Amino acid sequence: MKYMITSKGDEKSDLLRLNMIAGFGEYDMEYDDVEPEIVISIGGDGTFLSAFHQYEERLDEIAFIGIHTGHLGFYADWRPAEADKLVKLLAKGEYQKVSYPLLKTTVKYGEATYLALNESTVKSSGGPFVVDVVINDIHFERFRGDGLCMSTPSGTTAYNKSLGGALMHPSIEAMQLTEMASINNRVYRTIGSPLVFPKHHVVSLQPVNDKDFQISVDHLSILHRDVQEIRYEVSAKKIHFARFRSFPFWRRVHDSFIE
Amino acid sequence: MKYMITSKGDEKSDLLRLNMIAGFGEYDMEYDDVEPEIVISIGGDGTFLSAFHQYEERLDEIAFIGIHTGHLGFYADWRPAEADKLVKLLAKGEYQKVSYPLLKTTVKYGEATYLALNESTVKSSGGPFVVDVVINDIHFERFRGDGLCMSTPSGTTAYNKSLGGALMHPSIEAMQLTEMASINNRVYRTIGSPLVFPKHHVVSLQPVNDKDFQISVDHLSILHRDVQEIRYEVSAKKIHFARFRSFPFWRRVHDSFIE
Amino acid sequence: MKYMITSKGDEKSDLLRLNMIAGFGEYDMEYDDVEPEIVISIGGDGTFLSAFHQYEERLDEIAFIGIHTGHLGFYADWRPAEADKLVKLLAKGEYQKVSYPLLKTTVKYGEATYLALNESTVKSSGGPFVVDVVINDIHFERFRGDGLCMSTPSGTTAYNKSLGGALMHPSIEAMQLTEMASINNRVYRTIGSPLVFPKHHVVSLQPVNDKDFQISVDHLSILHRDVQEIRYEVSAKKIHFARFRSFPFWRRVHDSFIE
Amino acid sequence: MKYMITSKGDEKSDLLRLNMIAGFGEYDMEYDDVEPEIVISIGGDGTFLSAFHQYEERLDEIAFIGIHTGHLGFYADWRPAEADKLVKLLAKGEYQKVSYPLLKTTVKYGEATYLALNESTVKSSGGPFVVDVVINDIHFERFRGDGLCMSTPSGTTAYNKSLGGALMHPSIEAMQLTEMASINNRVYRTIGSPLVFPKHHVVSLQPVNDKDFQISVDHLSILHRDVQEIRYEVSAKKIHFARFRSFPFWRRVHDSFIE
Ligand SMILES: CCn1c(C)nc2c(N)ncnc21
Ligand SMILES: CCn1c(C)nc2c(N)ncnc21
Ligand SMILES: CCn1c(C)nc2c(N)ncnc21
Ligand SMILES: CCn1c(C)nc2c(N)ncnc21
């Protein structure tokens, strides 16, 4: 089975990577980083994030796995001491696949599409940030503040959580919008609460004055110029995970934030 | 078609009720408050809440409608001037049915089940409130504060919203838990963020010291004694609405909070 | 020097109390719980709270001290192993006095005054809670929600903190009001932010419909009937602490919440 | 009396400015923008902000006034129709002076000091933002998030309010720190609550990895490189306002946010 392994780059991860390659070397397991079926990431959730974007083109052909050499990550939920258990279980299968929803981000000018595993945010380049929020072609509010954040279900535990958003189970195919330091007075008015949109709901951001935005998708962030509208909706593509055990989402939330 | 009409009790509502009964009196429309198929509520969302609980037994046999004689309610979303339009459209049908999820609340002692349209809350009778939160038979946290609130999707715009929870579209079959003034220090630790649970997820509250709780379901609130566990999960029953127009949920959110 | 010692009542505290009485028995130290000059509390901050209210009449004649037999309290900031150090330093003095502001609460009917070290809260007895907030005889807002909380500076780390309020240094003679789950829509409007009032500013709560309120002062909470107005203002009396060391307020905040 | 008038630059403001200059032209009132005693700003609070920074050198020699040609500002609290009332009352005096606290910001490298009327914020240039927060030379926390904000009392109604901070009366000589989207998990830990520091308390921010920060003071924001520490403390200088009427701070808060 075609596979590849990305590493965080430090001593702990590169050496654990060479051990698994030697472990797979005892099986009928071909290494390939062009068209792999199993993508293993070793490091942290940030390392897993780059592994997902490296192969965002053939998501349906890949099952992702993550080893955390630091603390317990949400996508990297395998201890290094369990790596040899992993190599043996990958050899044939009998494992199952688990799929999480994704977020499609479309940006039109005078058109680029992105796929986000965690979240996508919008901020203003330099000056004030004012956008008209449009939900299913109906004007909902005029936002003035620092920015907005649209999050995937599994991405709610990251930036979405720091902004007051709700943590939602990844079996729910939905997206969640949150606000950043919005102004609310007798002039400007925002909803304030986080909003959870289902499949087939389109959230569109339209500029009011300035047309340049600092848009981010996960940990890649590039300034866009002459933006006409930013379009958010739950993607039709899903990321596929290889499951060998029973690690519930709420147990991962408990271990990361409670204890 | 069997129907009944509840009124808020004031001058504006009782007179609008007698007009619709006379309007239905010109059609093949039988009045019945024992086994109606169409339940019309005139007043506010609180009046709609009592209309739902009056007939929570045969929810699948009923389609609810609401007229707001005050401000725009979320369940009562028909202007009084549109009442004659309503009477004519009820006469034959051609309308469609729209269903929202509900919340089942089970209370065991040393067992009562409830159905909630908005939310169900738990508080302590007098003294401190300490409960162990159990998600799918796994201990998640020990809550110490004022109380907890489990909300339906359509109920997120009410008490759930005042507690910082997210507003989620009612097409999502889910429930949302929020916290009330929880203590978080170097001793006690709660998640803080709101939690959104899908279907078939069971949230269970277990007492630590005191066993008496002030439990509420919508606007009915009764003290319970010798409680063993409180069990929350998305109900299998759904409330059915009669739709004649296109009033999206986000448009109702906009009119109630933005403008 | 006249002194008395209250204990939490458990094994750890009563035995530490008898040791200090024997320690003071070797000095010119008279025990008196009628008119003491040094009030020592052994247990937790709740034990200190009762010690303060036991002698709220002669606050200016007393210097309070607190030993924490559990975790680090904010008022009980002496380890039990440092009790013998305490007994020796109390013997003559050379210690200094540190004063914190207090909160006066006046309740008028058709008049009772209270002194609060932590906070004073207002809630509704059973039904909805609606009060008109009046600041310096000027109407500021109409609050509809669960309740309000007026906190002392040193009391900001308690209930005030759980409600989102700011932690303010106790050298600032001020009070802080916070809200509990307020309703904000296109009908009702509250400020939302916590408010910090200086000396000589009077905050007055006036009923709108119901006239019965569940009013609390620290950990004593009694239902009041036929209430005309609740009046909050920074008290002119101050609680006096005996200081022997340098334990800054921000260091106490750090040890309790950070580590 | 030496005076000058800045204008927002639009039609409404420049024409109201020329009327007041002609109004002062009938009195013994000399126009001077080098060393004025009365600085009049016409426009919004942002126009007042630039008027303050234009003359931040001789604050003790100046009394500021503000006319709002748009909506009710907090510093610009005079209606344009009351401009002729203003010109007459400035002619001799009989008015009184009202002083507000300020925020001193010191930035050391391998030293620049600033004066802020609203707030001063810190953010990271590009990458993650990690700073060690030091209060009175004692380490308090390690902050990881989007940034921090230190606000003046009168500046609490601006950016400080959007971040959840408390609105505090400007008669209190203090500063308030608030957090922006901080990460809190089983690894990183921040206090979360806003902190209110009195006079003579020094808050110091120290870098952990990156040493470049985007620092702002009111509406001027410049990237700093090779930063050793950022030092916040309540300034010894105060801004002086000319008062002719009784417009309480809480009445200004009410008119801006409630109604
Ligand atoms: C900042 C580290 N991190 C990343 C890269 N993804 C996540 C995530 N889903 N939840 C929590 N923390 C996360
Ligand atoms: C307090 C009035 N009210 C009721 C009874 N239900 C709701 C609701 N779903 N959303 C908003 N307000 C509501
Ligand atoms: C609930 C325990 N507790 C009491 C009784 N006072 C306090 C206080 N000022 N800060 C924190 N916790 C406190
Ligand atoms: C953004 C407009 N604005 C300025 C420039 N100062 C303030 C202030 N103190 N309170 C509210 N709004 C403000």
Residue B258: CB partners within 8 Å, gap ≥ 6? A140, A141, A189, A190, A191, C186
User: What 8-state DSSP symbol labels residue A85?
Assistant: H
Structure tokens at C227: 């209430």
Least Cα distance to A34 among A10, A60, A62 occurs for: A62
A7 contacts A47 by C-beta, under 8 angstroms: yes
Least Cα distance to C74 among C153, C148, C10 occurs for: C153
Contact (CB<8Å) D250/C135: yes
Structurally, chain D folds into a number of domains equal to 2
Interface check A159 vs D, CB under 8 A: yes
Experimental approach was X-ray
Range of the domain at C143: 102-236
Residue D217: CB partners within 8 Å, gap ≥ 6? D105, D114, D115, D116, D120
Amino acid at position D81, single letter: A
What is the spatial distance between Cα D122 and Cα D114, in angstroms, rounded to a whole number?
A: 13
Structure-token match 């998030």, residue found: D145
Nearest chain B Cα distance for residue C186, angstroms: 5
Contact (CB<8Å) A256/D186: yes
Same domain, C3 and C52: yes
B117 contacts B39 by C-beta, under 8 angstroms: no
Ligand 2 mean position, distance from CA B86 (Å): 23
Classify A238 in phi/psi space as left (phi over 0), alpha (psi -120 to 50) or beta: beta
Contact (CB<8Å) D169/C201: yes
Same domain, A11 and A125: no
Query: End-to-end distance of chain A based on CA atoms, in angstroms?
Result: 37
Instruction: Output b/e per residue, D36-69; b: 16+ Cβ within 10 A.
Output: bbbbbbbbbbbbbbebbbebbeebeebbbbbbbb
Same domain, D114 and D223: yes
Give the CA angle between residues D82, D85, D91 to the nearest 5°: 140
Report strand pairing: B147-151 vs B129-135: unpaired
What is the spatial distance between Cα A151 and Cα A234, in angstroms, rounded to a whole number?
A: 10
Ligand 3 mean position, distance from CA C157 (Å): 7
- For residue D111, the SS3 value is coil
Cross-chain CB nearest to D257 (options C164, C191, C250): C191
List, chain by chain if needed, residues with CB within 6 Å of any ligand 4 atom: D 45-46, 49, 74, 118, 154-155, 157-158
Residues 207-246 of C with CB under 8 A from D: none
What is the spatial distance between Cα B45 and Cα B244, in angstroms, rounded to a whole number?
A: 19
What is the spatial distance between Cα D258 and Cα B203, in angstroms, rounded to a whole number?
A: 39
Nearest chain D Cα distance for residue A241, angstroms: 24
Residue minimizing CA distance to atom 12 of ligand 3: C158
Residues of A in contact with B196 (CB under 8 A): 166-169, 172, 196
What is the spatial distance between Cα A221 and Cα A46, in angstroms, rounded to a whole number?
A: 14
Residue minimizing CA distance to atom 13 of ligand 4: D158
Same domain, A139 and A187: yes
- For residue B186, the SS3 value is coil
Q: CA quadruple C165, C169, C170, C171: dihedral positive or negative? A: negative
How many residues comprise chain A?
A: 259
What is the spatial distance between Cα B168 and Cα B173, in angstroms, rounded to a whole number?
A: 10
How far is residue A4 from each of residues A24, A41, A64, B11, measured CA to CA in Å? 11, 9, 10, 74
Interface check B186 vs C, CB under 8 A: yes
Contact (CB<8Å) B181/C182: no
E-assigned strand segments in chain C: 3-7, 38-43, 63-68, 96-100, 103-108, 112-116, 119-124, 129-135, 138-145, 147-151, 167-168, 174-180, 195-198, 203-207, 213-217, 220-224, 229-234, 239-243
What is the spatial distance between Cα A132 and Cα A139, in angstroms, rounded to a whole number?
A: 7
Same domain, B165 and B138: yes
Residues of B in contact with A156 (CB under 8 A): 193
Phi, psi angle pair for A16, to nearest 5°: -65, -25
What is the spatial distance between Cα D102 and Cα D166, in angstroms, rounded to a whole number?
A: 17
A214 contacts A125 by C-beta, under 8 angstroms: yes
Same domain, B256 and B177: no
Least Cα distance to B69 among B39, B46, B103 occurs for: B46
The residue of chain A with its CA nearest to that of D259 is A186
Least Cα distance to C60 among C249, C241, C233, C234 occurs for: C241
Ligand 3 mean position, distance from CA D58 (Å): 46
What is the spatial distance between Cα C138 and Cα C126, in angstroms, rounded to a whole number?
A: 28
Same domain, A120 and A163: yes
Report strand pairing: A138-145 vs A129-135: antiparallel
Same domain, B145 and B91: no
Interface check B89 vs A, CB under 8 A: no
Ligand 3 mean position, distance from CA B134 (Å): 27
Same domain, B185 and B212: yes
Neighbour count for residue D236 (Cβ, 10 Å): 11
Please, which residues bridge with residue D175 across strands? Answer: D197
Least Cα distance to C165 among C153, C176, C174, C173 occurs for: C176
How far is residue D194 from each of residues D141, D163, D191, D229, measured CA to CA in Å? 13, 9, 8, 21
Best residue among C74, C221, C239 to mutate for probing ligand 3, ranked by most atoms within 8 Å of CB: C74
Ligand 1 mean position, distance from CA A75 (Å): 8
Contact (CB<8Å) B168/A195: yes
Report strand pairing: B195-198 vs A213-217: unpaired
Query: End-to-end distance of chain B based on CA atoms, in angstroms?
Result: 37
Contact (CB<8Å) C181/B162: yes
Q: CA quadruple C240, C244, C246, C249: dihedral positive or negative? A: negative
Give CA B239 to chain center in angstroms: 10
Give the CA angle between residues C190, C196, C197 to the nearest 5°: 105
Stated in angstroms to one decimal place, the resolution of this structure is: 2.5
What is the spatial distance between Cα C211 and Cα C8, in angstroms, rounded to a whole number?
A: 37
Nearest chain D Cα distance for residue A258, angstroms: 7
Amino acid at position A170, single letter: P
Counting beta carbons within 10 angstroms of the beta carbon of residue A91, is it exposed (0 to 12), middle (13 to 18) or buried (19 or more)?
middle
Structure-token match 């349209």, residue found: B117
Structure tokens at B227: 């409680």
Q: Is A158 in the pocket of ligand 1 (CB under 6 A)?
A: yes
Same domain, C106 and C225: yes
Residues 45-74 of B with CB under 8 A from C: 71-72
Neighbour count for residue A138 (Cβ, 10 Å): 12
Same domain, C164 and C123: yes
Q: Chain B to chain C, count of Cβ pairs less than 8 Å apart? A: 43
A177 contacts A235 by C-beta, under 8 angstroms: no
Looking at residue A227, which CATH number applies to its domain? 2.60.200.30
Interface check C1 vs B, CB under 8 A: no
Structure tokens at B142: 């020990």
What is the spatial distance between Cα D38 and Cα D3, in angstroms, rounded to a whole number?
A: 5
Least Cα distance to C134 among C69, C202, C184 occurs for: C202
Sheet holding A38-43, edge to edge: A3-7, A38-43, A63-68, A239-243, A96-100
Residue minimizing CA distance to atom 12 of ligand 4: D158
Same domain, D203 and D241: no
What is the spatial distance between Cα C151 and Cα C160, in angstroms, rounded to a whole number?
A: 6
Q: Is A49 in the pocket of ligand 1 (CB under 6 A)?
A: yes
What is the spatial distance between Cα B91 and Cα B244, in angstroms, rounded to a whole number?
A: 12
- For residue B106, the SS3 value is strand
Phi, psi angle pair for B197, to nearest 5°: -105, 140
D248 contacts D254 by C-beta, under 8 angstroms: no
Report the C-alpha dihedral over residues C159, C164, C167, C173, rounded to 10 degrees: -80
A36 contacts A4 by C-beta, under 8 angstroms: yes
